[PDB]
């Protein structure tokens, strides 16, 4: 469930999560929105694009 | 030169565009094929928002790319 985001995407909104290269997101779950995934990163739970995250299990 | 576009709903709308084309234009093409207001059209590529004030060439966006279309403050 924990993915690894190789990119430098910056949260544009409050509900957006900042995912950077190497940053692993805890318990990542695919939302009803295409590409949007939700997880816990840096102690903050937020959604982030799938084109910036790579599931690592 | 075609490019894919990820829609929150789940549609990959691939629109026609050139490397010299501006983002403000690309926005229109979307509002002309999907009816999505430009002021409500957020385009993010490579982890950085695309400025309606810049061209694809600026973000070195080539063919067969993959843009991300988001909405202002997503609650879903």
Swiss-Prot record, chain A:
Q: Which residues form the SH3 domain?
A: 1-57
Q: Where is this cross-link: Glycyl lysine isopeptide (Lys-Gly) (interchain with G-Cter in SUMO2)?
A: 57
Q: Which domain of life is it from?
A: Eukaryota
Q: Describe its PTM?
A: Phosphorylated on tyrosine residues; probably by c-Abl, Fyn and c-Src.
Compartment(s) of residence:
Cytoplasm, Cytoskeleton; Cell projection, Ruffle; Cell junction
Consequence of gene loss (knockout): Death at 6 to 7 weeks of age from renal failure. Mice show defects in epithelial foot processes, accompanied by mesangial cell hyperplasia and extracellular matrix deposition.
* Expression tissues: Expressed in podocytes (at protein level).
Q: Please state what the annotation says regarding this protein's domains.
A: Potential homodimerization is mediated by the coiled coil domain.
How this chain assembles, per its entry, is: Homodimer. Interacts with F-actin, PKD2, NPHS1 and NPHS2. Interacts with WTIP. Interacts with DDN; interaction is direct. Interacts (via SH3 2 domain) with CBL (via phosphorylated C-terminus). Interacts with BCAR1/p130Cas (via SH3 domain). Interacts with MVB12A and ARHGAP17. Interacts with ANLN, CD2 and CBLB. Interacts with PDCD6IP and TSG101. Interacts with RIN3. Interacts directly with RET (inactive) and CBLC; upon RET activation by GDNF suggested to dissociate from RET as CBLC:CD2AP complex. Interacts with CGNL1 and SH3BP1; probably part of a complex at cell junctions.
Query: What is this protein for, i.e. what is its function?
Result: Seems to act as an adapter protein between membrane proteins and the actin cytoskeleton. In collaboration with CBLC, modulates the rate of RET turnover and may act as regulatory checkpoint that limits the potency of GDNF on neuronal survival. Controls CBLC function, converting it from an inhibitor to a promoter of RET degradation. May play a role in receptor clustering and cytoskeletal polarity in the junction between T-cell and antigen-presenting cell. May anchor the podocyte slit diaphragm to the actin cytoskeleton in renal glomerolus. Also required for cytokinesis.
This protein is called what? CD2-associated protein
State the organism named in the record.
Mus musculus
Swiss-Prot record, chain B:
Instruction: Please indicate which residues carry the site annotation Essential for function.
Output: 68
Q: What is the effect of changing residue 68 to G?
A: Loss of DTX3L-mediated polyubiquitination of histone H3 and H4
Provide the effect of residue 76 to D.
Answer: Impairs ubiquitination by CRL2(KLHDC3) and CRL2(KLHDC10) E3 ligase complex
Q: Where is it located?
A: Cytoplasm; Nucleus; Mitochondrion outer membrane
Q: What is the effect of changing residue 42 to E?
A: Impairs ubiquitination by CRL2(KLHDC3) E3 ligase complex. Impairs ubiquitination by CRL2(KLHDC3) E3 ligase complex
Recorded coiled-coil stretches: none
Where does cross-link Glycyl lysine isopeptide (Lys-Gly) (interchain with G-Cter in ubiquitin) occur?
6, 11, 27, 29, 33, 48, 63
What does altering residue 7 to D do? Impairs ubiquitination by CRL2(KLHDC3) E3 ligase complex
Mutating residue 74 to G leads to what result?
No effect on ADP-ribosylation
> Impact of altering residue 44 to D?
Impairs ubiquitination by CRL2(KLHDC3) E3 ligase complex. Impairs ubiquitination by CRL2(KLHDC3) E3 ligase complex
Q: Which domain of life is it from?
A: Eukaryota
Q: Which residues form the Ubiquitin-like domain?
A: 1-76
| Lipid bilayer topology | Peripheral membrane protein
Outcome of mutating residue 76 to A: Loss of ADP-ribosylation. Impairs ubiquitination by CRL2(KLHDC3) E3 ligase complex. No effect on ubiquitination by CRL2(KLHDC10) E3 ligase complex
For the modification Phosphoserine, which residues carry it?
65
Q: Give the result of residue 63 to R, as annotated.
A: Abolishes HLTF-mediated polyubiquitination of PCNA
ADP-ribosylglycine modification, residue list:
76
Substituting residue 74 to K results in: No effect on ADP-ribosylation
How is it modified post-translationally?
Answer: Phosphorylated at Ser-65 by PINK1 during mitophagy. Phosphorylated ubiquitin specifically binds and activates parkin (PRKN), triggering mitophagy. Phosphorylation does not affect E1-mediated E2 charging of ubiquitin but affects discharging of E2 enzymes to form polyubiquitin chains. It also affects deubiquitination by deubiquitinase enzymes such as USP30. Mono-ADP-ribosylated at the C-terminus by PARP9, a component of the PPAR9-DTX3L complex. ADP-ribosylation requires processing by E1 and E2 enzymes and prevents ubiquitin conjugation to substrates such as histones.
Crosslink site(s) for Glycyl lysine isopeptide (Gly-Lys) (interchain with K-? in acceptor proteins)? Answer: 76
Annotated site residues (Interacts with activating enzyme) in this chain: 54, 72
The chain residues annotated with the modification (Microbial infection) ADP-ribosylthreonine are 66
Give the protein's biological function: Exists either covalently attached to another protein, or free (unanchored). When covalently bound, it is conjugated to target proteins via an isopeptide bond either as a monomer (monoubiquitin), a polymer linked via different Lys residues of the ubiquitin (polyubiquitin chains) or a linear polymer linked via the initiator Met of the ubiquitin (linear polyubiquitin chains).
What is the recorded name of this protein? Ubiquitin
What species is this protein from? Homo sapiens
Native organism taxonomy? Eukaryota, Metazoa, Chordata, Craniata, Vertebrata
Region of the whole protein represented: 1 to 76 of 685
